[PDB]
């Protein structure tokens, strides 16, 4: 449908594909930022489906942590989101460090895992 | 040098090129988001060079408006930034609307103009 849960998961899925394409073009910073966004929407979908809500990146990340058991997320899964956020902050707002191919691939693979787990949690792996 | 003014302008310039490549791959939402980031860093460079500072997107946008005369920016130039921010919000955080090729090209061309004007203002068109 056109409900928020469906559209969030669809947005997360599209962003994962966009990030894959950025990676192949060698746009490693852009890949990291997009991959974080995919995870953000997936997190928001999980919070929606389980009657929680957030209005900030940090708020969203901590709620995911708090609700991990119910959501079927491991501690590593929750760390995937924290780390992707921190790396997105560097990609979008940092001016000294450049992001390597190897960092970007790490975040991309984390996004794939995190978004799949989100789909599982909200019964959208359908 | 490795000073903030130089690195901000360099970041803005790189982001404009990244956005051009996203556009060519057909990643229209990603293009808009990247183009806004280019303009953001260019705005921060102009504020730095003219002894002002900001800590929010909206704060940055309003300071650019306030300082436009001194910066050599037209009202349209300031509207380029406001609109690019609003469209970046839709590209990154919206879940209903998709961004067309024609919107993305508009924002891309605005970023090119805005970043050049920023370079002029801070004497980095060198």
Swiss-Prot record, chains A, B:
PANTHER family: UPF0332 PROTEIN TM_1000. It comes from the Archaea. This is UPF0332 protein AF_0298. Belongs to the UPF0332 family. InterPro entries: HEPN_dom, UPF0332_toxin. It comes from Archaeoglobus fulgidus (strain ATCC 49558 / DSM 4304 / JCM 9628 / NBRC 100126 / VC-16).
């Amino acid at each position: 449908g056109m409900d928020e849960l469906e559209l969030r998961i669809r947005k997360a899925e599209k962003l994962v594909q966009d990030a894959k394409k950025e990676f192949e073009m060698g746009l490693y910073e852009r890949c990291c930022s997009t991959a974080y966004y995919a995870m953000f929407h997936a997190a928001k979908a999980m919070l929606l489906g389980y009657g929680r809500d957030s209005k900030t990146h940090r708020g969203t990340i901590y709620l995911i942590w708090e609700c991990r058991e119910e959501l079927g997320l491991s501690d590593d899964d929750c760390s995937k989101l924290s780390r992707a956020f921190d790396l997105r902050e560097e990609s979008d707002y940092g001016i000294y460090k450049e992001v390597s191919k190897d960092l970007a691939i790490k975040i991309l693979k984390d996004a794939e895992i995190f978004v799949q787990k989100a789909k599982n949690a909200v019964n959208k792996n359908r």
